[PDB]
Amino acid sequence: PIVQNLQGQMVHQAISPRTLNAWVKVVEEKAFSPEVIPMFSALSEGATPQDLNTMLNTVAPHQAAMQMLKETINEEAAEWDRLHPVHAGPIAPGQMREPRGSDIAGTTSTLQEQIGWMTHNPPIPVGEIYKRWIILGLNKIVRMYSPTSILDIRQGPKEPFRDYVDRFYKTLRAEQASQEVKNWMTETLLVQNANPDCKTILKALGPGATLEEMMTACQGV
Amino acid sequence: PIVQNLQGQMVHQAISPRTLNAWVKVVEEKAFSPEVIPMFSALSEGATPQDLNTMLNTVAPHQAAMQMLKETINEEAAEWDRLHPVHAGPIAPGQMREPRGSDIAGTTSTLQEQIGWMTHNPPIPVGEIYKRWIILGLNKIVRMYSPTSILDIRQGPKEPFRDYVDRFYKTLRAEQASQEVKNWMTETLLVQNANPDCKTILKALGPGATLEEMMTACQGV
Amino acid sequence: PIVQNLQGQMVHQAISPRTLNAWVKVVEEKAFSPEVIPMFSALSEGATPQDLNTMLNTVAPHQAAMQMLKETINEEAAEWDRLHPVHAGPIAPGQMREPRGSDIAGTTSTLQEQIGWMTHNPPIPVGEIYKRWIILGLNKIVRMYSPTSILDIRQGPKEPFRDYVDRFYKTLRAEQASQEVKNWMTETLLVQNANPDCKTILKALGPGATLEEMMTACQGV
Amino acid sequence: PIVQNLQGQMVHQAISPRTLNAWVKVVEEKAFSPEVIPMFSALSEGATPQDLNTMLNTVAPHQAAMQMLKETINEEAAEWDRLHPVHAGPIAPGQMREPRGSDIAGTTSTLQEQIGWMTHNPPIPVGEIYKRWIILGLNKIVRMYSPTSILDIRQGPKEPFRDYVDRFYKTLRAEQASQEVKNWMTETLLVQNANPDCKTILKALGPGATLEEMMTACQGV
């Protein structure tokens, strides 16, 4: 992250060892469950590209996930270079240069360059964009590691309705289908795969019933 | 680690008690699993040789692991002395002397010497090299304590494919074979030791199929 | 082969009918076992490219093996042409021209050309190189026809250790893995797949035990 | 071998392809049984060191046997060099030089040198000595590959006595014990391990009975 010294200047501060260890525990203990993404977003709050690469070093022992992340990052960097062509000409002495795709990811840039780029009026967030690319890669990884399809999430004969709903929505978040497909799933498949008693109640409830009404009507069933 | 005082001078800061306690919990509770190495790397982030020896004091009650670490450290120090002979002659007043193998490990050096050595332009990282030697020793220890061979990692009849892949790759990381041998293992043994249904599907998939394609084709099997 | 006439001149001699019949028996009766390669090497001893094509005519009824051989030969001829470019310019009257890839295989050359090329001071062996290409093709064929993986070679409960070792090494020769992979196989998999009594003895024997020591310790078990 | 041309000069003749194929069949089909040694002696009759190395090329795919052969050959060559020191001084123009250990094995010598060395009055057999070294190596290999100890050769309850004697003596030839130990074995162990009826008859026959008398007395038992 970025901190201010006693002289009022923006200075980079390294990630604390226990934050890095929390990230390591998340990587090594949760098997790339969907909750890894909110935890990564929280643990990398206000980070620099060098800090993000330090956090990514934890993923390196997982070859498939790391390769997927690297492919996503390279594609995003190529797209960034395509959409931000290197202008040929003079540059104002008071204005800093434009970083490239290899520079936002911190492959060739330095710490001071990123500190200056992030701290500006108006600021151009380089850490946030790299973080978003990491999140795209992580979403792909979570999709790859998902053990069950949404079509295989069925309510147990004695399973409470709220637990079935939680499992269903967790699997839906893992799968990351299209928005229209997701809406169709939440509207139709959730009712379709319920157990007979809750299914009868939900059918009696009618189409267009909100999730709150369904959980109310199926609370003790 | 190294911190800056109000006067702008680099000053050593001791490891916080809770970071040391986290390291103690890792040592005493995980039985030298492969995840001990990323956790040690995170918890010793930006540390000095004195801090590294403080962290190593936790390993001392484990006689075999500590002896293996000491052997690896002594061998690395001897190699460092061989590759960095003590030059006989004058030394510039503004340039500090060259530490020996017993000095990078902090056996004979002092805190100020290591602080000066690490904080330089350009810097010579003494903490990182000692840390790498520790990691070599820890890798040897993890290999020693591994309970199962990779040849004994077989998918259960009802075990999901992703869990089998995770166990297989964790054992592979523990064993630390040669790169060519590791590639052969990931290409052949993973398919060989799968359960009959996934094995049939993977055989139909053909050689050279990526891990993502295999996990996709075996998701619900 | 090449023989000398009464005048001291090198003359080509055709392969005897019974040598050709021995080669035919090898091709038609052994199902491309690994021993086909030493037998082909012995039976084609000191042969000319025309003789080698005569021997290859026996393989033609086997479409897959013959196609694999032709692909290997064409690739080797293309590589030979690439590494031996046709020089444009004068040629010494006493020095013969350089054969092409289609010429070493005897597709376009004549018998006298090959006789002169092989009989020279210093000699340039054209028959040996074509033979080596044939051996590469035959190795590929033997790999294709191998019925069992090395991972499936397991010592029987009452099988003598020497027979298990012979089967293991025959399969290893058939598979033709990389040298490092082969060393790992002979060091680890042979012990891993032995029966419980021999496995206990070999484990007690320790790593780095020679094959002779293992066969001595497991002789009557 | 060595043949004479029309001018009366000794000329080397290569081994015929079918003799080499017979040797290949012996190597690849008999699993280093004791009969491999008489067959090698017959098939290498009157051979040159180059011919012997050509025959040894068949053994190369068998790593353990080939390594044992190479160790025996190197030891014999070192002993030959020790017992035949290189004399420093003039050499007669009509007398050829003394080959070294690397020269009798054909590693550095040429065909003409060996032809001249073998064809002399009086002749110094270089092929025979190399052949004897090969036979020592092969005897070691046959000992290594022997599946049963002599102590485990026991006559079956209905096995004819002549077959038991043949198996016993074949195992004894494989084991190659000391002469006194071999005499003790043939005198005591053969009677000891016979079946009860033949054992009773042989005990009644008394010590010092010849093998012919034993086979006569046990013919139909």
Numbering used by the authors:
A (entry chain A), B (entry chain A), C (entry chain A), D (entry chain A): 1 to 221
Give passages from the manuscript:
The HIV-1 capsid is a fullerene cone made of quasi-equivalent hexamers and pentamers of the viral CA protein. Along the body of the cone, the CA subunits are assembled on a hexagonal lattice, with the CA amino-terminal domain (NTD) making hexameric rings that are linked together by the carboxy-terminal domain (CTD). Twelve CA pentamers occupy sharp points of curvature—termed declinations—exactly 12 of which are required for the capsid to completely close. Here, we identify a Thr-Val-Gly-Gly motif that modulates CA hexamer/pentamer switching by folding into a 310 helix in the pentamer and random coil in the hexamer.
To stabilize the 310 helix and thus favor the pentamer, we replaced the two glycines in the TVGG motif with alanine and proline. Crude modeling indicated that these two substitutions are compatible with the backbone configuration of the dipeptide in the pentamer state, but not the hexamer state. Indeed, incubation of CA-G60A G61P with IP6 induced assembly of small spheres of around 20 nm in diameter. Cryo-EM imaging indicated that the spheres are T = 1 particles, or icosahedra made of 12 pentamers and no hexamers. We solved the cryo-EM structures of these T = 1 capsids to 2.2 Å (CA-G60A G61P), 3.1 Å (CA-M66A), and 2.4 Å (CA-G60A G61P M66A). These confirmed that the mutant pentamers have the same structure as the WT pentamer, with the switch in the 310 helix configuration and the gate in the open configuration. CA-G60A G61P formed only aggregates, supporting the interpretation that the mutations locked the protein in its pentamer state. In accordance with our prediction, the CA-M66A, CA-G60A G61P and CA-G60A G61P M66A T = 1 particles were not stabilized by the FG peptide.
